Amino acid sequence: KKNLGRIAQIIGPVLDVAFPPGKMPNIYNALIVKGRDTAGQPMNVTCEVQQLLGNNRVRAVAMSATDGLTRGMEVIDTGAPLSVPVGGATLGRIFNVLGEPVDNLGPVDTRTTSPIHRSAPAFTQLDTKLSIFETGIKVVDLLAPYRRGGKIGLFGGAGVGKTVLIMELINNIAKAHGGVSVFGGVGERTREGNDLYMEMKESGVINEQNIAESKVALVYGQMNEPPGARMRVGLTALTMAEYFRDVNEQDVLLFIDNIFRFVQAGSEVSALLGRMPSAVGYQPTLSTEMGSLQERITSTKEGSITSIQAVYVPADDLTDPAPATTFAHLDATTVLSRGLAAKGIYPAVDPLDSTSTMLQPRIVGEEHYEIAQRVKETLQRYKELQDIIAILGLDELSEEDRLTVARARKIERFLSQPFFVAEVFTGSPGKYVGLAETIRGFQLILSGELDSLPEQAFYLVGNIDEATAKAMNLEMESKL
């Protein structure tokens, strides 16, 4: 604070700033440029110093645009990291990385605030609670149970149903929650964030007539932003959730989409901060950065955080170094496929590659675990059978094998449910399936008493009763 630093270089989004030799900012401090815009008025372009370079010049990263920044501008150290407002004022307000209300409402109560960069909890303050919670989506309920307070990844490609699933998951979980929720948008379509804002304005959880009675705080660092905003919106949202769990001590939720845009923003700015390129083009500081971000997201002995975050996978390759790094910091992982996506089965959750840590005999009950491992068994049998029955033919399998083929072909369709938010995309009223209904359906399908139903009867039905009523519908229409 109270120095006068001058810009010395502007290579696009990175800046080189020089200080008097007495004072020099610390790493992860917050500069603020007293520059000027096109109209001549003083405009602030906030910055974070990422590196000490020597010869009393430091290297910054712009949290906003550089168009209009001149070599010879003045900057002021704030002597701190980027503090973000917290409390009950951050409820029902769209927020930027800069902690400013983006929605056209008034300012925020800034007597209580918290810095972005803190360290993860100690090893002794982690709550080993392994309770299960019923999601509603049949695959997400049965095959891959979600841990309460444990992180959860939605690994998927582009346009398979990550965002639809996470929005419908908000639609399901938030209204039946017992605490606050926070949403951090990291590199998404702006119209889709506004779609979420409007759909939650009409779904009452904003209750925008009376503020601070809302149950969601919205942070957005989306795709039209310089890499600083995308690189730090995750940290802003996580600091808000950490305040909600540490001072209020209540169960908070944290939907992080898209985290691959956070890592991509890191790499985009990192190639220009002088660092050598790592594997295929990500930064060398990949794994420890994802640790410094993720391991703050944790349950604790004050209030747990269940973090359903949507991870993008480039080219549908789970080999890729960002999914390869992100797999480690997640408990209940879900794989969204393209085969089941274009196959018609929505949601496109790959039943064989989605695997959780909660599906246990002693954690999720005996009949559920046996039926889940049995379903994965018969599907693995079918996918093994596929490249044989391709060229061999269908009249050259045995009765057990053809029965397996037909039953798996029923099962795969039955794991498709018309979502609440997908009524625009399906043409069907929304559905909510219980865990009891799903295990009943799979007992009934597997044990043999439904092999006279059509293999399109299980397509987009909620309950096995609805599958039977759809079966009657199909057969009655065909017999006329």
């Binding site: 080219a315 549908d316 390759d317 080999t319 490249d387």
Partner: peptide, 11 residues
């Protein structure tokens, strides 16, 4: 995904 799909076509 090219090498994985190529290995799987080999298989």
């Amino acid at each position: 995904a090219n090498l994985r799909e190529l290995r799987d076509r080999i298989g």
